[PDB]
């Protein structure tokens, strides 16, 4: 469960990301596609070359949903209901991939926010992405 300190750590961290969220989203996706090629099977229709626009745009959607989740931290299942619906009944991404994207996001954050990515903050963001992941796969079956 997220503790009060976790929620605090995450709102803080995400607050700095600020207007760069869309860019970090795209960056995370790019690192996932290269580090973990099996994840590309979920985007056969996307142009996956470096800096291409589908990844750009999709990066923004990912980040926006995460901002929504940060802003609704005490209330995630509700704030993310429709996204959860979409994942369970249409996208149907195997649960293991959420760990891989989560990890790429952390790497992206570590690399852009060196002063903010302390151990305690690393711990809370990992718990947070896992919580988000749990919610998006909650209605699979």
């Amino acid at each position: 469960v997220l503790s009060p300190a976790d929620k605090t750590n995450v709102k803080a961290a995400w607050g700095k990301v600020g207007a760069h969220a869309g860019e970090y989203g795209a960056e995370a996706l790019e690192r996932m596609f290269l580090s973990f090629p099996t994840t590309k099977t979920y985007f056969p229709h996307f142009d996956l070359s470096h800096g291409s626009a589908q990844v750009k745009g999709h990066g923004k959607k990912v980040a926006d949903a995460l901002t929504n989740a940060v802003a609704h931290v005490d209330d995630m299942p509700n704030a993310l209901s429709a996204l959860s619906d979409l994942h369970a009944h249409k996208l149907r991404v195997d649960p293991v991939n959420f760990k891989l994207l989560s990890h790429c996001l952390l790497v992206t954050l570590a690399a852009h926010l060196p002063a903010e990515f302390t151990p305690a903050v690393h711990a809370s963001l990992d718990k947070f992405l896992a919580s988000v992941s749990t919610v998006l796969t909650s209605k699979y079956r």
Partner: protein, 146 residues
């Protein structure tokens, strides 16, 4: 695949008793029912809405047969799984776009189906040998992904 001859003879002996025309269907069917998200790959198979619609779907049964025939063929070449599945690996990646994790899910369901059919005869040692086999097969189907 690192298999002792004690493991290989046990694996092979059991396989001799397998009715591939039934086990393949059970295994594909159970995959679609227990892990319903894997249904995203089989929309053209018709009605998959209830356990009976899946298990009795004739397209499911026919397809399960192909899967197991290819599996059997892998048991005939346990020392060269990669080569044996090379072209299937390419197809599942480049044409079908199937997440290799699904090969592990199927493998584990197959082991359950083997358990169900053979009972006591699916001994713990025999299971351990089949688990090595299904991981080997999963790894080989994943080897040409890029």
């Amino acid at each position: 695949v690192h298999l002792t001859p004690e493991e290989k003879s046990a694996v092979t002996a059991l396989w001799g008793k397998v009715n591939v025309d039934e086990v393949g269907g059970e295994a594909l069917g159970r995959l679609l029912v227990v892990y319903p998200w894997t249904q995203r790959f089989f929309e053209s198979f018709g009605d998959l809405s209830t356990p009976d619609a899946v298990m009795g779907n004739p397209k499911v049964k026919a397809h399960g047969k192909k899967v197991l025939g290819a599996f059997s063929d892998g048991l005939a070449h346990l020392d060269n799984l990669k080569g044996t599945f090379a072209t299937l690996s390419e197809l599942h990646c480049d044409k079908l776009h199937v997440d290799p994790e699904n090969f592990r899910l199927l493998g584990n369901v197959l082991v359950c189906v083997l358990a169900h059919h053979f009972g006591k005869e699916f001994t713990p040692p025999v299971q351990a040998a089949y688990q090595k086999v299904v991981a080997g097969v999963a790894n080989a189907l994943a080897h040409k992904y890029h």
